[PDB]
Design an enzyme around this catalytic site. Structure first.
Site, short mmCIF file in Angstrom:
data_model
loop_
_atom_site.label_atom_id
_atom_site.label_comp_id
_atom_site.label_asym_id
_atom_site.label_seq_id
_atom_site.Cartn_x
_atom_site.Cartn_y
_atom_site.Cartn_z
N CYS A 98 0.84 -1.20 0.00
CA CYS A 98 0.00 0.00 0.00
C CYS A 98 0.87 1.25 0.00
O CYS A 98 1.97 1.25 0.57
CB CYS A 98 -0.91 -0.01 1.24
SG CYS A 98 -1.93 1.47 1.47
N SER A 126 0.63 3.69 1.81
CA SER A 126 0.94 4.06 3.20
C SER A 126 2.21 3.38 3.72
O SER A 126 2.93 3.97 4.54
CB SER A 126 -0.24 3.83 4.15
OG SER A 126 -1.39 4.56 3.73
N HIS A 169 4.86 5.50 2.55
CA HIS A 169 4.90 6.72 3.36
C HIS A 169 5.79 6.54 4.61
O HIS A 169 6.39 7.50 5.08
CB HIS A 169 3.51 7.16 3.83
CG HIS A 169 2.61 7.72 2.76
ND1 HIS A 169 3.07 8.27 1.58
CD2 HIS A 169 1.26 7.84 2.73
CE1 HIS A 169 2.04 8.69 0.87
NE2 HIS A 169 0.93 8.44 1.54
N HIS A 217 0.52 -3.71 6.44
CA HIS A 217 -0.76 -3.67 7.14
C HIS A 217 -1.95 -4.20 6.34
O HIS A 217 -3.08 -4.26 6.86
CB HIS A 217 -1.05 -2.22 7.56
CG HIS A 217 -1.19 -1.29 6.41
ND1 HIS A 217 -0.11 -0.83 5.68
CD2 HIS A 217 -2.29 -0.73 5.86
CE1 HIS A 217 -0.54 -0.03 4.72
NE2 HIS A 217 -1.85 0.06 4.82
N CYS A 250 -6.99 -3.48 3.47
CA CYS A 250 -6.81 -2.02 3.42
C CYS A 250 -7.41 -1.38 2.18
O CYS A 250 -8.45 -0.74 2.26
CB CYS A 250 -5.34 -1.61 3.52
SG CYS A 250 -5.24 0.20 3.53
N1 LIG Z 1 -7.64 6.75 4.78
C1 LIG Z 1 -7.21 5.48 4.76
O1 LIG Z 1 -7.64 4.62 5.53
C2 LIG Z 1 -6.20 5.10 3.72
C3 LIG Z 1 -6.07 3.74 3.38
C4 LIG Z 1 -5.19 3.39 2.36
C5 LIG Z 1 -4.44 4.35 1.73
N2 LIG Z 1 -4.55 5.65 2.08
C6 LIG Z 1 -3.80 6.72 1.37
O2 LIG Z 1 -4.48 6.93 0.17
C7 LIG Z 1 -3.56 7.38 -0.86
C8 LIG Z 1 -3.68 6.48 -2.09
O3 LIG Z 1 -3.16 5.16 -1.83
P1 LIG Z 1 -2.79 4.19 -3.07
O4 LIG Z 1 -2.24 2.95 -2.47
O5 LIG Z 1 -3.95 4.16 -4.01
O6 LIG Z 1 -1.64 5.07 -3.74
P2 LIG Z 1 -1.02 5.15 -5.21
O7 LIG Z 1 0.29 5.84 -5.00
O8 LIG Z 1 -1.03 3.80 -5.85
O9 LIG Z 1 -2.03 6.07 -6.02
C9 LIG Z 1 -1.94 7.50 -5.95
C10 LIG Z 1 -2.21 8.02 -7.34
O10 LIG Z 1 -2.24 9.46 -7.32
C11 LIG Z 1 -1.67 9.94 -8.51
N3 LIG Z 1 -1.23 11.33 -8.35
C12 LIG Z 1 -0.06 11.77 -7.80
N4 LIG Z 1 0.02 13.10 -7.80
C13 LIG Z 1 -1.15 13.53 -8.38
C14 LIG Z 1 -1.65 14.84 -8.68
N5 LIG Z 1 -1.13 15.97 -8.28
N6 LIG Z 1 -2.88 14.86 -9.26
C15 LIG Z 1 -3.58 13.73 -9.55
N7 LIG Z 1 -3.16 12.50 -9.31
C16 LIG Z 1 -1.94 12.44 -8.72
C17 LIG Z 1 -0.53 8.95 -8.84
O11 LIG Z 1 -0.16 8.98 -10.22
C18 LIG Z 1 -1.18 7.63 -8.42
O12 LIG Z 1 -1.89 7.04 -9.50
C19 LIG Z 1 -2.17 7.42 -0.19
O13 LIG Z 1 -1.91 8.69 0.38
C20 LIG Z 1 -2.34 6.43 0.97
O14 LIG Z 1 -1.42 6.61 2.03
C21 LIG Z 1 -5.43 6.04 3.05
O1 LIG Z 2 -3.20 2.83 4.66
C1 LIG Z 2 -3.71 2.77 5.99
C2 LIG Z 2 -3.05 3.83 6.84
C3 LIG Z 2 -1.85 3.55 7.48
C4 LIG Z 2 -1.23 4.51 8.28
C5 LIG Z 2 -1.75 5.79 8.47
C6 LIG Z 2 -2.95 6.16 7.86
F1 LIG Z 2 -3.51 7.38 8.02
C7 LIG Z 2 -3.65 5.18 7.02
F2 LIG Z 2 -4.80 5.56 6.45
ZN LIG Z 3 -3.12 1.03 3.44
#
Ligand SMILES: NC(=O)c1ccc[n+]([C@@H]2O[C@H](COP(=O)([O-])OP(=O)(O)OC[C@H]3O[C@@H](n4cnc5c(N)ncnc54)[C@H](O)[C@@H]3O)[C@@H](O)[C@H]2O)c1
Ligand SMILES: OCc1cccc(F)c1F
Ligand SMILES: [Zn+2]
Ligand SMILES: NC(=O)c1ccc[n+]([C@@H]2O[C@H](COP(=O)([O-])OP(=O)(O)OC[C@H]3O[C@@H](n4cnc5c(N)ncnc54)[C@H](O)[C@@H]3O)[C@@H](O)[C@H]2O)c1
Ligand SMILES: OCc1cccc(F)c1F
Ligand SMILES: [Zn+2]
Ligand SMILES: [Zn+2]
Ligand SMILES: [Zn+2]
EC number: 1.1.1.1
Lengths: 374, 374
Positions: free
Chosen positions: B46, B48, B51, B67, B174
């Site tokens: 993921c 994250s 990150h 995770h 996730c």
């Molecule tokens: N809230 C939650 O529970 C939760 C859970 C999982 C992931 N996340 C977060 O969600 C986000 C997405 O996760 P993912 O695994 O899909 O990531 P990913 O990196 O696979 O996808 C992100 C996408 O955003 C695009 N992107 C980058 N900069 C951009 C811009 N300025 N404009 C438009 N698009 C742009 C990238 O090309 C990529 O396709 C991450 O920040 C991650 O940490 C949050």
């Molecule tokens: O991807 C899940 C996750 C892991 C760590 C911190 C986060 F905010 C979160 F949404």
């Molecule tokens: Zn995640």
């Protein structure tokens, strides 16, 4: 008898920011098609009117302000179908055109015909009905109620109960409906919940009324002016707090008081910092915060989006989220049926010519709502 | 056979920021009371987890990250009741203790026992079950799935269907559940609505799936990497736009495309600027915008609160709003009944030992989800 003719009357003109209102002889044109000329009966002094004076709210000057009012229709323009001469009416600072995407939406109330987003200070047709010594005077929010007579577009007026006391129901034109609806319609405050209300003026007191009507178990009033607390409690606050009393930030105090954060908070002041504080003090996973206060023009707040990611909901609304033309008549009917009280909001009653005293009272902190009568 | 014994196995340890994972021998303690030791079968990569490497998401190092996973229970501590040895399980990065005010709230899912807000990188009892090179190693979100074996608290694991394919259902841990839930549960997307999804990785594609399941009429995918567009359309996007192709800011483009703003927008990237943009592109009076992306640690965004005062709703969520232990087994059950698809999210499968290659695939823009197999 004055139908179809220019009316010469007194209005309160604001020529410049940060000056007293100036009572001037103005000329009010007759209404054109789909317009309504109203003889004012009562108008409230709302903080938003003061925002025009202070420069907080930017709108074309010179201007006849005033947006919280009730009057009687003096005449109607051609094609007007929703009101008649002699009708009691409340001007609507947020219109309801009935045809735009927002008006058609189940929840939306910010009609695209509003003169709030990008104020022109005119009638819908781009012109003014007001002149002072040949000079055109701008309108305010399509209402302009600080005048013996005004002219509004049909979409900015609602017919109300002929038996209604205008000296009271004028508050339904802004302060009450904004506050009450923010609680009952926008936040959808739940039974047994804990609420925090920042700002205990006319609008914040109406938010408390709304929270109490919704069955909230706890309603925490927050104000830096402790003289506001007695009336806050009278209308339903269970406790009041003054941030100036504490050596620590009030969101902390409120988080401990509420055992981990409140269910619902409301910013009813108009400061960036209290908007952020109100958001913070709601519970991180399921709390909701509603912005009601108007902040200073063109100023951005700073906040950490992690406050939202945990699950908080942040929203704002105009006029309590009420579709204006539909809701104003029903709120009046509800007032007539004793469903809520308006008297607790009214602390002073002055004749219209004493407008500047009315604003002195607001600014000194002594009043909630002053009603100006004609 | 390993029950009650220290296990020696391979794990990917992150010793320092901005460095490759180091695949090495670790020691995994047996589970204590109300703990569960899991033999990992499959784990996704993921954003994250990346990150953590980049320092965007701060958690104590050194760490076993990971995770988004599924495995088989190897043994249980005393007093465990909800899983047994041999059960298929998914670790829950958002726990469900069932007892806190959040778990008891009908809407909340961000259980107060989470290790996300104020990361300790431990088990619930504040100690670690991992040793490497004689040093204790931190856990990550109470899961730590980048290891052949992990130990989790009972509140952070759910029993799933005995016949489920773990190399697929790990995504319910996730990325899928987060995106899907953000649409269906958090935003509550409506039939016939218009949606805008910023970010077309595994989570954004999952948001699209949810928007389509909710019966959205239009789903506009937004990404700066046009190679993401094909898959987005496959899973339900009706249009895709790249900000770089346009002279106007994308919020303006999106507003035009939607005849005044979208009904629902989603930030699924993790940038402060796109969080504000996604807010701006939803209709000013009734639009809803959901933040899903994780922003860089301790950075504030700047926004104009007039975007909210007009009537917009801004919220965010962890794990799509799902109460984790209730929801994960139901989601697996739905997957096995083919109510949604996970295959479209899986672009690469690699053995665990090739974890760094898996991260390279993500960082280059080449992959959606790589599944690591043990
Ligand atoms: N809230 C939650 O529970 C939760 C859970 C999982 C992931 N996340 C977060 O969600 C986000 C997405 O996760 P993912 O695994 O899909 O990531 P990913 O990196 O696979 O996808 C992100 C996408 O955003 C695009 N992107 C980058 N900069 C951009 C811009 N300025 N404009 C438009 N698009 C742009 C990238 O090309 C990529 O396709 C991450 O920040 C991650 O940490 C949050
Ligand atoms: O991807 C899940 C996750 C892991 C760590 C911190 C986060 F905010 C979160 F949404
Ligand atoms: Zn995640
Ligand atoms: N959204 C809408 O449709 C709408 C409608 C009407 C009014 N408003 C806005 O709502 C706000 C309230 O209007 P009102 O007529 O009740 O005003 P008011 O001035 O009567 O009430 C404001 C209260 O805030 C208190 N206050 C000031 N600074 C404070 C601080 N730092 N902390 C705590 N309390 C503080 C004051 O003591 C006062 O009691 C204004 O910004 C007004 O423009 C918005
Ligand atoms: O008091 C109503 C009002 C008047 C002018 C501007 C506003 F934002 C507003 F809410
Ligand atoms: Zn007002
Ligand atoms: Zn309209
Ligand atoms: Zn809990």
């Amino acid at each position: 008898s004055t139908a179809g003719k220019v009316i010469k009357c007194k209005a309160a003109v604001l020529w410049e920011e940060k000056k007293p209102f100036s009572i001037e002889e103005v000329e009010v044109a007759p209404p054109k098609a789909h317009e309504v000329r109203i003889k004012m009966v009562a108008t409230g002094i709302c903080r938003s009117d003061d925002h025009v004076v202070s420069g907080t709210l930017v709108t074309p000057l010179p201007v006849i302000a005033g947006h919280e009012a009730a009057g009687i229709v003096e005449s109607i323009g051609e094609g007007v179908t929703t009101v008649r001469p002699g009708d009691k009416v409340i001007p609507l600072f947020t219109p309801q055109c009935g045809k735009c995407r927002v008006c058609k939406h189940p929840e939306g109330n910010f009609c695209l015909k509003n003169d709030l987003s990008m104020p022109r200070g005119t009638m819908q047709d781009g012109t003014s009905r007001f002149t002072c010594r040949g000079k055109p005077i701008h309108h305010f929010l399509g209402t302009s109620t600080f005048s013996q007579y005004t002219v509004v577009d049909e979409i900015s007026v609602a017919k109300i109960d002929a038996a209604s006391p205008l000296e009271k129901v004028c508050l339904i034109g802004c302060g009450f409906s904004t506050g009450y609806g923010s609680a009952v319609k926008v936040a959808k405050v739940t039974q047994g919940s804990t609420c925090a209300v920042f700002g205990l003026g006319g609008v914040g007191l109406s938010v408390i009324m709304g929270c109490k009507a919704a069955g909230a178990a706890r309603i925490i009033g927050v104000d830096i002016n402790k003289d506001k607390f007695a009336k806050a409690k009278e209308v339903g606050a269970t406790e009041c707090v003054n941030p100036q009393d504490y050596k620590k930030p009030i969101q902390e105090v409120l988080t401990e008081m509420s055992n981990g954060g409140v269910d619902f908070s409301f910013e009813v002041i108009g400061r960036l910092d209290t908007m952020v504080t109100a958001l913070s003090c709601c519970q991180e996973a399921y709390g909701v915060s509603v912005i009601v206060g108007v902040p200073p023009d063109s100023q951005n707040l700073s906040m950490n989006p992690m406050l939202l990611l945990s699950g908080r909901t942040w929203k704002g609304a105009i006029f309590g989220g009420f579709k204006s033309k539909d809701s104003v008549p029903k709120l009046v009917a509800d007032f007539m049926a004793k469903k809520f009280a308006l008297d607790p909001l009214i602390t002073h009653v002055l004749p219209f010519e004493k407008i500047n005293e009315g604003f002195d009272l607001l600014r000194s902190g002594e009043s909630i709502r002053t009603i100006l009568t004609f």
